[PDB]
């Protein structure tokens, strides 16, 4: 045989501790470089001028932060959507002043997660499985891409992306609420229903399966020891569990098929997350949620308020105080 054939046989081998595959060639370097840069920048980075008004903001541990308030600041507003690699700065100090590491981390990270999906499919193929797990994983990837890349593209600046921090996430959420009126977009309601229903069904399924265990342990050992690796037993007792579910609610509602059950379980949260990601992506292009301000009037013509007006007051309060020194003109276009 040749050298290339041996290399290919080693790459696609299903006997290593961790599968490599051809997608792993793009996966591993990008994720590793993103991790290294993120750790170093989170620990020891200097303040970054995020808004382009020459007012740097500290975000690293060594400059007086804690775990909660630390972050990696997005790039400067003066840059916009321009590409800013290291070799385009006159010095490393200038590169760090304008928020260089954010772009590097984000780009290598997104490439890494795409390769992660590909690698999942590849191992599924090599193991003789059915190839539909990476489709399920595509939803968190879609949401992360939506925020990190799509929102800056629509708004025209990397500085509007979500900061890589804990309190930066809250700041992003609050400003997004103030500017786009989320919580009134039906796609956000779809996402909330998705997560709540996912938690509900996880708890219900766990309870039902755990309650229907046959007797193999008696008292003085954890019940988990009954199951053996490779044992043959369907994940319930049909009589007890089916009767319990058919008696708890009306008898017409009971899943007697494991396939349909475990399909519904997979389908619900994935669809919810897809819809909420598309909601964020569409709101990136200034298509906001429902507007119900001053919609109820009496006979004379005066305005009677509703709860939407209280929400509007909160939105105005958030809006008038964000980026205090950044605006010069009456409209925030």
């Amino acid at each position: 045989v040749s050298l290339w054939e041996r290399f290919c046989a080693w790459i696609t081998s299903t006997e290593n501790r961790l599968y490599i595959g051809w997608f792993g060639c793009l996966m591993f370097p990008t994720l590793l470089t993103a991790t290294s840069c993120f750790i170093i920048a989170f620990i020891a980075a200097p303040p970054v001028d995020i808004d382009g008004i020459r007012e740097p903001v500290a975000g690293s541990l060594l400059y007086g932060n804690n775990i909660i308030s630390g972050a990696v600041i997005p790039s400067s507003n003066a840059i916009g959507m321009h590409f800013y690699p290291i070799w385009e700065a006159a010095s490393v100090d200038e590169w760090l002043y304008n928020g260089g590491p954010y772009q590097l981390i984000v780009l290598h990270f997104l490439l890494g997660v795409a390769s992660y999906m590909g690698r999942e499919w590849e191992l599924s193929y090599r193991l003789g499985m059915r190839p539909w797990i990476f489709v399920a994983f595509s939803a968190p990837v879609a949401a992360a891409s939506a925020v990190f890349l799509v929102y800056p593209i629509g708004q025209g600046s990397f500085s509007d992306g979500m900061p890589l921090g804990i309190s930066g996430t809250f700041n992003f959420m609050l400003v997004f609420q103030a500017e786009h009126n989320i919580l009134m977009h039906p796609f956000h309601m779809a996402g909330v229903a998705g997560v709540f229903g996912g938690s509900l069904f996880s708890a219900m399924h766990g309870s039902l399966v755990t309650s229907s265990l046959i007797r193999e342990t008696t008292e003085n050992e954890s019940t988990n020891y009954g199951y053996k690796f490779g044992q043959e037993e369907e994940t319930y007792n049909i009589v007890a569990a089916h009767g319990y579910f058919g008696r708890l609610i009306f008898q017409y509602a009971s899943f007697n098929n494991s396939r349909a059950l475990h399909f519904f379980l997979a389908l619900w949260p994935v669809l919810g997350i897809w819809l909420t990601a598309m909601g964020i992506s569409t709101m990136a292009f200034n298509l906001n949620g429902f507007n119900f301000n001053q919609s109820v009037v009496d006979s004379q013509g005066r305005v009677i308020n509703t709860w939407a007006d209280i929400i509007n007051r909160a939105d105005l309060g958030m809006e008038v105080m964000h980026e205090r020194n950044a605006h010069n003109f009456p409209l925030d276009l």
Binding site: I43, L61, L62, N66, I67, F229
Partner: peptide, 28 residues
């Protein structure tokens, strides 16, 4: 001076993850 504590906690968590991944009880 608390940056030392934060760094130690994070590095300890990463060490625990490494040991869990690579030094694990066999599924058999």
């Amino acid at each position: 001076m608390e940056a030392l504590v934060y760094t130690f906690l994070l590095i300890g968590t990463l060490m625990v993850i490494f040991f869990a991944v690579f030094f694990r009880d066999t599924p058999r």
